[PDB]
């Protein structure tokens, strides 16, 4: 059975996600419009930039994150932002469409749209297979939120200083997730291990995306289409 | 009477402007849309960024600019870009509307729109008075183009190294403008001196705009709405 402090963690984590993920997607109309040359890079740059702001907002409400040093907060967000974006995007992904559908057909993204923003199938094929296998997991909101917080608070990320403290935070969160699945998820005997595998998959997607981001950001005619926030977060500064 | 080399300068300068100013404004639909908090800063950031690219393209076709060192090219563009944007924008300005009208009502900019991008009447009132007095000048395309090239190739700008060479280029261009007005502009006895006054006005508008840009760029929640190109060009790096 779950403890009261374990459930407060779940509560504040669910509230943090509802405050930072807007299921109406009505904010997307103020991105630079999509074009279907890298015709999709402006719109996807704005989507990712907007998403980074929401991840930062989510992190700030993870119990204990706000108490990390600013350098550790930055270090965790610089290494994990792209992974949390891939995880959180599962909420718009459709198994039927094999795409991310954000309200309108203007904001429905195919693999092919992402190729017109500079990425290759070396990234997009593992990414779509990741989305589908994650979507088939049929996670409760509690579990999806916990996995994002676990991903964010991983200590084996370059740049972290207070390894012990953030690993203790991640331990707490993992213990919550394991208990939640056991008590509250019928037939989830294998679910915790599957979700931990997904964390491994995200590392691999992070590395490929970082490879392909370096190729973009070294071409100023493309990097100039990015936003300041994207340049800061995906950049290589320490 | 005008010489053949003087008229080749006029020719290549008019061609350079037609290649870099699109009177259809159809590119404006891919800016982040206008909102009427700094609701207009995203759209105006994209307008200015787009405009900087066109000024760079215009400069590259000024006779002699391309032969300057890259550092002198950069130095001239960093100090003059905002002035050339103010000059070139006269082509969309309407005396009847007291605004810049770029095709559609979506892309019609009031003084009030520019205040919702962070600027104050300390800038906008002199700027609008500048536009109207420039518009009343009723310049020929030849003269408008020459004034932009003269403005760009001014040597009294911080950072310039080959002062002698770019002043010789500006002398050539001024001699062209003086001859053109005398031969080709009926009743323009006083026009050359008025246009030189406008160059002085632009310095004053440059200084105020730079003051107000510093206040924006020191607030990261606003500067993050700018583009990489705007940050580079209006930035203080050398």
């Amino acid at each position: 059975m779950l403890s009261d402090e374990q459930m407060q963690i779940i509560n504040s984590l669910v509230e943090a996600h509802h405050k930072t993920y807007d299921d109406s997607y009505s904010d997307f109309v103020r991105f630079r419009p999509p074009v279907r040359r890298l015709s999709m890079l402006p719109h996807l740059a704005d989507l990712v930039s907007y998403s980074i702001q929401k991840v930062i907002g989510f992190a700030k409400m993870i119990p204990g994150f706000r108490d990390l040093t600013a350098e550790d907060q930055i270090a965790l967000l610089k290494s994990s932002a792209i992974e949390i974006i891939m995880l959180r995007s599962n909420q718009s992904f459709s198994l039927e469409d094999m795409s991310w559908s954000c309200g309108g057909p203007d904001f429905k993204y195919c693999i092919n749209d992402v190729t017109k923003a500079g990425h290759t199938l070396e990234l997009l094929e593992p990414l779509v297979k990741f989305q589908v296998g994650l979507k088939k997991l049929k996670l409760h909101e509690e579990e999806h939120v916990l996995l994002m917080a676990i991903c964010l608070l991983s200590p084996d990320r370059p740049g972290v200083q207070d390894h012990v403290r953030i690993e203790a935070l991640q331990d707490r969160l993992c213990d919550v997730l394991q208990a939640y699945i056991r008590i509250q998820h019928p037939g989830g005997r294998l679910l915790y291990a599957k979700m931990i595998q997904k964390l491994a998959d995200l590392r691999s997607l992070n590395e490929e995306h970082s490879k392909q981001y370096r190729s973009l950001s070294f071409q100023p005619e493309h990097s100039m289409q990015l936003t300041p926030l994207v340049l800061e977060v995906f950049g290589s500064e320490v | 009477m005008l010489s053949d080399e003087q008229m080749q300068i006029i020719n290549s300068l008019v061609e350079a402007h037609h290649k870099t100013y699109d009177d259809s404004y159809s590119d404006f639909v891919r800016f982040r849309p206008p909102v009427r908090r700094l609701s207009m800063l995203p759209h105006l950031a994209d307008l200015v960024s787009y405009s900087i690219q066109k000024v760079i393209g215009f400069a590259k076709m000024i006779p002699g600019f391309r032969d300057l060192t890259a550092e002198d090219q950069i130095a001239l563009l960093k100090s003059s870009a905002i002035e050339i944007i103010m000059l070139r924008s006269n082509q969309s300005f309407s005396l009847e509307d007291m605004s810049w009208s770029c095709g559609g009502p979506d892309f019609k900019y009031c003084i009030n729109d520019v205040t919702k991008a962070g600027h104050t009447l300390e800038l906008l009132e002199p700027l609008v008075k500048f536009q109207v007095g420039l518009k009343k000048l009723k310049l020929h395309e030849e003269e408008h183009v020459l004034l932009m090239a003269i403005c760009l190739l001014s040597p009294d700008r911080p950072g310039v190294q080959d002062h002698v060479r770019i002043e010789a280029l500006q002398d050539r261009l001024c001699d062209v403008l003086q001859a053109y007005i005398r031969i080709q502009h009926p009743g323009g006895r006083l026009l050359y001196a008025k246009m030189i006054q406008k160059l002085a006005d632009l310095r004053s508008l440059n200084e105020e705009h730079s003051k107000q840009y510093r206040s924006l760029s020191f607030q990261p929640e606003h500067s993050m709405q700018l583009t990489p190109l705007v940050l580079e060009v209006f930035g203080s790096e050398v």
Binding site: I56, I74, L77, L229, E232 | P220
Partner: peptide, 10 residues
């Protein structure tokens, strides 16, 4: 460094 990140992290 990380001007925007610092700002957003409050």
């Amino acid at each position: 460094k990380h001007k925007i990140l610092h700002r957003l992290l409050q």
